[PDB]
Structure 1
Amino acid sequence: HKIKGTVVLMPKNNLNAFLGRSVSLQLISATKADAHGKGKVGKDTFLEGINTSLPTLGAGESAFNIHFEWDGSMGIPGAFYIKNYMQVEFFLKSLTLEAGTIRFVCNSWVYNTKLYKSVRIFFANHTYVPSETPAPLVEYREEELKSLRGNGTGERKEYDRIYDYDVYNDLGNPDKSEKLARPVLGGSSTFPYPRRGRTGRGPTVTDPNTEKQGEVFYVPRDENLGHLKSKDALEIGTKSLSQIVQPAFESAFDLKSTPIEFHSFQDVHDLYEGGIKLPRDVISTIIPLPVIKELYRTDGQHILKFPQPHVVQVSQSAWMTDEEFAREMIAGVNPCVIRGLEEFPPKSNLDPAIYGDQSSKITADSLDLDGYTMDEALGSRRLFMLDYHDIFMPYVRQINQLNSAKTYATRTILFLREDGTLKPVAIELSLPHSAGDLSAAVSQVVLPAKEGVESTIWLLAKAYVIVNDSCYHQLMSHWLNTHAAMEPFVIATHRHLSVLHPIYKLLTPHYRNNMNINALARQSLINANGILETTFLPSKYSVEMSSAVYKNWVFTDQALPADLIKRGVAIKDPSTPHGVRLLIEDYPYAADGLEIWAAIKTWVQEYVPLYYARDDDVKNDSELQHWWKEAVEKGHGDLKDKPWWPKLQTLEDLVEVCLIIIWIASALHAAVNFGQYPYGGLIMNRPTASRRLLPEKGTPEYEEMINNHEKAYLRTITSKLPTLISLSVIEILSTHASDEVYLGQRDNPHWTSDSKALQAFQKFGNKLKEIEEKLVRRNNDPSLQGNRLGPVQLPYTLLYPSSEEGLTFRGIPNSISI
């Protein structure tokens, strides 16, 4: 008696070579055990032929027939070993055993057998907490986790599947130059930081504490996502941009083939209209590269044309309105920093002995609050702020010592008008002062103006605010809070939860591509002299600023309701559907976010009880306890002393932790990521850097504000060359790959055999579709036009769950995937 099987696999890039003695599988019993309690193993069984009968295959997949000698006396197969005797690795999709069908979802690269210390093992798609593991599989389950953890030593190789932690000691390049040395981020009280995936390349020659450079920054093999279409390999684009395209742009500027600076706002608009003319060999260098070639239209000879950013598709001037500047604090790229202001003037916690008197210079009587007194505005909860004063002030002196960087620590006061829109009413541009200061520049307050030199000064004040906001968005809202904060949970999950584990199945879709993009980011984006440092204001101080901010990162404050309450933009109200009442009722990010949050909460609350009947079932789950202990004490270990970490001894705590992880990875990351080119593709709307402070009266620079305000603005913000690079990187990051897996989707319909879990997941997907219809109605509601569309007429679609491929300004992926 033989069991009929079907193996589906994808060749690395003909089929008969998989036959003969190329690939053997051995079934492993879940129910019948050897003398040591381990499931019995069948004979080596080779692929016998190509199956061309199976109608649904697609995706460059091939199917192979196989028949296993297996008596009922051997029990029910629950796992299998596979050995690849071919030289080249293949991608194993699945095994299916017929006549209830048994399904194995594998989705794993299988390298040549000689490269593996122990044989590759795959489990059938049943789901078990550890106390429910069929005994003959208990040791196999634990051994496979031991294999995944490795031993904390060694240089990781491409085919390794070893998950472990290290500090961010791989960003500096001190062996190339002392100027490229960077502080180790993580593992000290000076610089706390999330851990990242261990690579083990070993030390630089000049510094035992910094990891040597490498051509490839390892990730565990199945974290390195293949793509059927090379245009979908968006993560490789930053590498190409830093390594190939950036030097090509630089040469064009070095040879004076294009003007060095923008001279008018039209020179910026030209980038997406007629394009920019570049040297032939510069176009030729750029035009044939995968991913990069999708970023620009070209004549193939001299022109690159960027796509028209969403923010200018209806009005190219509306970004400069005060209405849009404020609206983007609730519905823009970075909609999560604004806070309620409940006293006046705003206060600082910084030491005046270091920075000088920190009293705000904004006077209440100077403000136009539409007829409200300050006491009325405070009491009616109509006063808000965008407060970068205490965040930036500690870094202003060192940033301003750089050539071509000058910033202020900014604070913007906002008033919620009776019509429900925000209006900006003052900007404070603060500088530190200490006795021995060389600079005579002073802090100042700038108020709104529509005419004259005062309008130029106000427009520049908004630019200094948005340089602070862009830096905070890129480093903190985006990099720290999503990419970096998530990676420790990815590592802990593979180290401690078996593929069989229900919480592994719940969480892992929300990790797709995260370790991969992070490793590529450590190599080319956040490295010394990398893309971020060379395009953003803080230069070599950028990543360490994120460490300072991480000192105040609180896991439980990443929950959306807790975030809203903490920032004073909502109050707890148990008479409301979400348990919070928004203080800005039409706050598009928050109002749409609450819907997505509630949908995820329902899903987690339905899934958890399928596997855990009482609080103890959580207390007695050994993998779960080890997982969470390690995630906290190792992964986020610099904050292990903090009192706010959930303990994980109850059903409530398990739901909370899973809910927060899924929210960060899916909707939070989407809302801060997919608006980058749509809003920031016009550099004047989202400047990444500022290069000079406000000019003094009686100077040429002051006269230029009067006579050529667009040039004054362009000389203040990001220069043309870093603009071309920053626009290219945010274009890649704002694109959805065509093989994305969105919230409410999974990569395989058979991820579990548990029908109740599958039903709950279908309900979750239906609810997300229901939510999308509701968000469409919100965008179509003329009463919500001021905040959901603004004068840019850009419907807020960033939290629509679904999307087609491309630069769509919508769609919530499961994971931090770009």
Structure 2
Amino acid sequence: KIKGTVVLMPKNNLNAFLGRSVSLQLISATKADAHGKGKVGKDTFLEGINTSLPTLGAGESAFNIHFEWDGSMGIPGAFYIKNYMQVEFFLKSLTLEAGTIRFVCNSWVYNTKLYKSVRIFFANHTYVPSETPAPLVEYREEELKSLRGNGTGERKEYDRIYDYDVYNDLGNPDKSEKLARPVLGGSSTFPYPRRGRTGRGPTVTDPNTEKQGEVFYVPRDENLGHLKSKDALEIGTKSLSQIVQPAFESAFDLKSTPIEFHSFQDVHDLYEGGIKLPRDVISTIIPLPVIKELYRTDGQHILKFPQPHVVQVSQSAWMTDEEFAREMIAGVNPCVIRGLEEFPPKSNLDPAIYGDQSSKITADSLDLDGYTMDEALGSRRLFMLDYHDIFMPYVRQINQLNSAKTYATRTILFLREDGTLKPVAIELSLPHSAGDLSAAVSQVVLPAKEGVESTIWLLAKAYVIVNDSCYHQLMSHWLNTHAAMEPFVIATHRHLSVLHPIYKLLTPHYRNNMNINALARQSLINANGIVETTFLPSKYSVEMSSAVYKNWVFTDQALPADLIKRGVAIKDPSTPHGVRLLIEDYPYAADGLEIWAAIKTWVQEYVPLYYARDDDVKNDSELQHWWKEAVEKGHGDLKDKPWWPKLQTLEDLVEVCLIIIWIASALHAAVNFGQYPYGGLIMNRPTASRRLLPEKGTPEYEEMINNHEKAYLRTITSKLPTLISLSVIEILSTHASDEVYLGQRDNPHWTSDSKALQAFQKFGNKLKEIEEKLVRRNNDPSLQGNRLGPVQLPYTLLYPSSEEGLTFRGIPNSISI
């Protein structure tokens, strides 16, 4: 007999797993039947509870099992398992002793009757397809066929079927015509990454829109369970939209709290004394998992939000021009600023539609610390935050909404000799066309510290940051991380076996991504969901991200390519990373290059363990099918584009894996974990603007003079949507205590290959080394202006490690929140 140990986690006593409850059958990797498929042994049941091993913990139990297995039956390489119990359990592992064979499973096993085919698990060996032991080749391909399913049917909780569909599940046209939304994906008008297929079928009123459902399916093992309810952060979004948001709304409908903030102190009060709300509103929040962690409460009437990092040292520093500019390089959205190499800035928009698009900013009006414009341009000291061409096509329709008004903005920045950025002009642009009923005009606003001009300049920064917050949430964050990554998740499970080296390399970087995305489609980006009800563009929000996706380029997601494309660095082979930054102390980019380099080294060391030559990549059938599908189906609306890597070389494989890991880990961390730390003060990161600048001689103009804080608050996001936005960004900025960070894996035995395990240890050591280096940077007094700023907030977003909570640091493996 072969002595084995099964470790599993009950859904939630242990004796019910005994008798005839659970059977396993070992499968040979070396002895085949007459069809060349590995021989399968007898059904073998769990025989007793193992009590010996202390190294267990975390709700796990271990079971003893002995398999009949003459050396005749060869060496086991897989096993089947059948659960005869009513309730599913979570299978962790099988270990066969005496040399040892390890099976890492980490999968829910439902009752046997629910599966078309018996659950199969492979030993922890790694094989490209041409290396699969012959008796497992068919089992390997059949499991992939199982995972792909057939493209039809309503997916159920226990299904493990990965497939693609368009974003046609956001609208709710059966409820109201007002909730109808365009399908995103699958047309030239609205290209978009695909998402995981759910198959709920058509609405009554629109055969192109998928009907509503209480649960948005993900393949079962994508739906992460948590030992602690407080760690199920993704379910908070659902509770917030479905339960908490209506509770807040009723407090305002009943006039139990003032409808608007009246001064900046009313906002600061949220994390000081708190806000007083009706008892039944407090009573709605307090017992909810995740939500109850968002606020401190007296259990009666008070909710208090946590103090955001951006105000922890100075509550007024956000208002400084130094901090406004610094956050474009070290803030929540540090990846949009561009070099400006000519002046005035140009527009590619059609003047026949929007009016003359010539910039109104004059060079002679700008304070460039004594530099002439030619000098600033030539010394590469001029930059911009350019939302003009992005927003202008949407300004007319946005401004037609009740309580939304925006400009398409452009901000010019000058890189001072001291290495900090300063803002020197903001252009607030509006489209103009012959029939317009509005008399509002485009304006240029310059910095000012006193008088009504200082208030107009503060408002101008707010309009800019409304554009930036919208672009950050929809494009930098949602489109470029969450949405862009999902097609790669699906392709990987459809086409790379669990045995495949590139499966093992990439899948840690997918943890929880399909799950959070599905919950997002249900409650965050749905019609009348959180984003539409809290951000400027309202019902146009998600379609705006489709327009931006038209210009998404996979190879420009690589950090060096991004920096070069935006004109914030230049190619320079004489530097360690091959690029020279044009803003030397650009914290996101300088820290990012270190992480990028570490990932690249890891990928370059792993790949050659499995692919010796370009030919070995061309000839890997799973890899070729994977990449073909990811591009032609997953990102199929951009399959016509010339820039996709072809995947016929070692270099191409490294490039593709490096970009995927980068997007999933560091890029997402840098744009996600700063949300509450910077945006928890709504004045610092307004999500919406509700009026344009006022005309002279109006009461709104006199208000700017007499009550500037009220002028500002009437312009930005109202109090009710503020309470909702703050709550959701608090959730999304939190690290669950069971997170798995870059340099970590959930199991030490993910492969039996010692060289791959060594390479991975080297990678984790390098990240520790990098963190020491980043610590030294933050402690360097010369770098204070950009790494800390007047808010005195050290840039820690790209520190690789973190404890649980709202920590402003730590790089998870994946897009996990």
Structure 2 residue 4 is matched with structure 1 residue 15? no
Quote the residue 1:206 is aligned against: 205
CA deviation vs aligned residue, 1:155-189 (integer Å, no higher than 9, x gap): 00000000000000000000000000000000000
Could you list the structure 1 runs, at least 4 aligned residues long, displaced by more than 3 angstroms after superposition. Answer: none
**Superposition deviation, residue 197 in structure 1:** 0.1
2-side partners of 1:625 and 1:708: how far apart?
Answer: 64
Quote the residue 1:276 is aligned against: 275
CA deviation vs aligned residue, 1:64-88 (integer Å, no higher than 9, x gap): 0000000000000000000000000
CA deviation vs aligned residue, 1:612-637 (integer Å, no higher than 9, x gap): 01100000000000000000000000
1-side partners of 2:353 and 2:374: how far apart?
Answer: 32
CA deviation vs aligned residue, 1:493-517 (integer Å, no higher than 9, x gap): 0000000000000000000000000
What is the root-mean-square deviation in Å for CA atoms of aligned residues?
0.2
SS at 2:406 equivalent: coil
2-side partners of 1:227 and 1:98: how far apart?
Answer: 30
2-side partners of 1:14 and 1:538: how far apart?
Answer: 53
2-side partners of 1:236 and 1:341: how far apart?
Answer: 43
Quote the residue 2:588 is aligned against: 589
1-side partners of 2:41 and 2:311: how far apart?
Answer: 65
1-side partners of 2:127 and 2:81: how far apart?
Answer: 22
2-side partners of 1:193 and 1:100: how far apart?
Answer: 49
**Superposition deviation, residue 526 in structure 1:** 0.1
2-side partners of 1:76 and 1:55: how far apart?
Answer: 29
2-side partners of 1:71 and 1:596: how far apart?
Answer: 50
Unpaired runs of at least 5, structure 2 = none
2-side partners of 1:734 and 1:55: how far apart?
Answer: 35
2-side partners of 1:536 and 1:31: how far apart?
Answer: 60
2-side partners of 1:396 and 1:80: how far apart?
Answer: 59
2-side partners of 1:122 and 1:204: how far apart?
Answer: 38
SS at 1:242 equivalent: helix
1-side partners of 2:437 and 2:112: how far apart?
Answer: 67
CA deviation vs aligned residue, 1:640-681 (integer Å, no higher than 9, x gap): 000000000000000000000000000000000000000000
SS at 2:643 equivalent: coil
1-side partners of 2:493 and 2:742: how far apart?
Answer: 21
1-side partners of 2:72 and 2:715: how far apart?
Answer: 79
CA deviation vs aligned residue, 1:185-243 (integer Å, no higher than 9, x gap): 00000000000000000000000000000000000000000000000000000000000
**Superposition deviation, residue 751 in structure 1:** 0.1
CA deviation vs aligned residue, 1:557-616 (integer Å, no higher than 9, x gap): 000000000000000000000000000000000000000000000000000000001100
**Superposition deviation, residue 405 in structure 1:** 0.1
Quote the residue 2:793 is aligned against: 794
SS at 1:414 equivalent: strand
**Superposition deviation, residue 491 in structure 1:** 0.1
Per the normalisation by structure 2, the TM-score is: 1.00
SS at 1:297 equivalent: coil
SS at 1:4 equivalent: strand
**Superposition deviation, residue 780 in structure 1:** 0.1
1-side partners of 2:514 and 2:67: how far apart?
Answer: 37
**Superposition deviation, residue 342 in structure 1:** 0.1
**Superposition deviation, residue 803 in structure 1:** 0.0
SS at 1:9 equivalent: strand
2-side partners of 1:460 and 1:739: how far apart?
Answer: 42
- 1:799-810 → structure 2 map (5 Å cutoff): 799-810=798-809
CA deviation vs aligned residue, 1:132-157 (integer Å, no higher than 9, x gap): 00000000000000000000000000
Quote the residue 1:357 is aligned against: 356
SS at 1:65 equivalent: strand
**Superposition deviation, residue 293 in structure 1:** 0.1
2-side partners of 1:156 and 1:280: how far apart?
Answer: 41
Quote the residue 1:506 is aligned against: 505
SS at 2:573 equivalent: coil
1-side partners of 2:52 and 2:39: how far apart?
Answer: 32
2-side partners of 1:236 and 1:69: how far apart?
Answer: 45
1-side partners of 2:244 and 2:188: how far apart?
Answer: 38
**Superposition deviation, residue 465 in structure 1:** 0.1
**Superposition deviation, residue 542 in structure 1:** 0.1
CA deviation vs aligned residue, 1:680-701 (integer Å, no higher than 9, x gap): 0000000000000000000000
2-side partners of 1:697 and 1:330: how far apart?
Answer: 35
1-side partners of 2:736 and 2:19: how far apart?
Answer: 37
Quote the residue 1:156 is aligned against: 155
1-side partners of 2:130 and 2:116: how far apart?
Answer: 28
Quote the residue 1:253 is aligned against: 252
Quote the residue 1:777 is aligned against: 776
Quote the residue 2:135 is aligned against: 136
**Superposition deviation, residue 487 in structure 1:** 0.0
CA deviation vs aligned residue, 1:710-766 (integer Å, no higher than 9, x gap): 000000000000000000000000000000000000000000000000000000000
Quote the residue 2:30 is aligned against: 31
Per the normalisation by structure 1, the TM-score is: 1.00
2-side partners of 1:613 and 1:466: how far apart?
Answer: 49
2-side partners of 1:652 and 1:130: how far apart?
Answer: 20
Structure 2 residue 426 is matched with structure 1 residue 456? no
SS at 1:816 equivalent: coil
1-side partners of 2:631 and 2:568: how far apart?
Answer: 29
SS at 2:380 equivalent: coil
SS at 1:67 equivalent: strand
Unpaired runs of at least 5, structure 1 = none
SS at 1:410 equivalent: strand
- 1:619-658 → structure 2 map (5 Å cutoff): 619-658=618-657
SS at 1:671 equivalent: helix
SS at 1:589 equivalent: helix
2-side partners of 1:340 and 1:450: how far apart?
Answer: 26
SS at 1:662 equivalent: helix
2-side partners of 1:71 and 1:366: how far apart?
Answer: 89
2-side partners of 1:643 and 1:598: how far apart?
Answer: 26
2-side partners of 1:236 and 1:259: how far apart?
Answer: 30
2-side partners of 1:75 and 1:735: how far apart?
Answer: 49
1-side partners of 2:398 and 2:189: how far apart?
Answer: 19
2-side partners of 1:27 and 1:227: how far apart?
Answer: 30
SS at 1:298 equivalent: coil
1-side partners of 2:816 and 2:412: how far apart?
Answer: 35
Quote the residue 2:708 is aligned against: 709
SS at 1:81 equivalent: strand
Quote the residue 1:720 is aligned against: 719
SS at 1:95 equivalent: strand
CA deviation vs aligned residue, 1:39-59 (integer Å, no higher than 9, x gap): 000000000000000110011
1-side partners of 2:534 and 2:74: how far apart?
Answer: 62
2-side partners of 1:568 and 1:614: how far apart?
Answer: 35
2-side partners of 1:246 and 1:618: how far apart?
Answer: 51
SS at 2:357 equivalent: coil
2-side partners of 1:290 and 1:461: how far apart?
Answer: 40
**Superposition deviation, residue 556 in structure 1:** 0.1
1-side partners of 2:299 and 2:287: how far apart?
Answer: 10
1-side partners of 2:30 and 2:746: how far apart?
Answer: 29
SS at 2:24 equivalent: strand
**Superposition deviation, residue 520 in structure 1:** 0.2
2-side partners of 1:285 and 1:334: how far apart?
Answer: 34
Quote the residue 2:476 is aligned against: 477
Quote the residue 1:316 is aligned against: 315
Aligned pair count reads 817
SS at 1:131 equivalent: helix
**Superposition deviation, residue 814 in structure 1:** 0.1
SS at 2:755 equivalent: helix
SS at 2:793 equivalent: coil
1-side partners of 2:373 and 2:748: how far apart?
Answer: 58
- 1:362-761 → structure 2 map (5 Å cutoff): 362-761=361-760
**Superposition deviation, residue 100 in structure 1:** 1.1
SS at 2:314 equivalent: coil
SS at 1:757 equivalent: helix
2-side partners of 1:191 and 1:254: how far apart?
Answer: 37
2-side partners of 1:286 and 1:43: how far apart?
Answer: 53
